[PDB]
């Protein structure tokens, strides 16, 4: 990413309640209710998988 100038592939994962099902490294989130946004995302450290939630206000 070095510049500041300007058939969408179909999507089969979309909503959730195993890891690939969640897609490692992809942003997930909840319906923003009551002025608070919840993000989630799963990452790998070596052999381990942490699914991190961030509770954020707007």
């Amino acid at each position: 990413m070095y510049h500041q100038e300007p058939a969408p592939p179909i999507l089969p994962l979309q909503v959730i309640l195993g890891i690939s099902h969640v897609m490692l490294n992809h942003l997930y989130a909840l319906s923003i209710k009551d002025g608070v946004m919840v993000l989630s995302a799963t990452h790998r450290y070596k052999k381990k998988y942490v699914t991190t939630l961030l509770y954020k206000p707007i």
Partner: protein, 98 residues
């Protein structure tokens, strides 16, 4: 329980695209287009110096509905990838939101 992936817009893809380029330029990100449904975006971190990066991929989920997707890239550390991700995604979504 109701965990939605990325964000869902219904505006036209090219439009959508521009909206994001605009946001990003406002949010003061620089990007590299990889194609009209994928961009690699980057953000300098002023306190840190280091950059944070992520991938935008547009999808179609219906015929009248779309889905924009965010993906991450690469004594306390200065620099917190997962948090800087979340923050980068948040700022955009807010910028877009309104």
């Amino acid at each position: 329980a109701k965990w939605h992936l990325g964000i869902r817009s219904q505006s036209k893809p090219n439009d959508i695209m521009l909206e994001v380029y605009r946001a990003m330029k406002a949010l003061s990100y620089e990007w590299k287009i990889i194609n009209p449904y994928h961009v690699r975006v980057r953000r300098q971190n002023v306190k840190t110096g280091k950059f944070s990066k992520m991938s935008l991929q547009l999808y179609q989920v219906d015929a009248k509905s779309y889905l924009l997707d965010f993906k991450s890239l690469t004594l306390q550390p200065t620099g917190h990838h997962t948090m800087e991700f979340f923050e980068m995604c948040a700022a955009l979504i807010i910028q877009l939101a309104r």
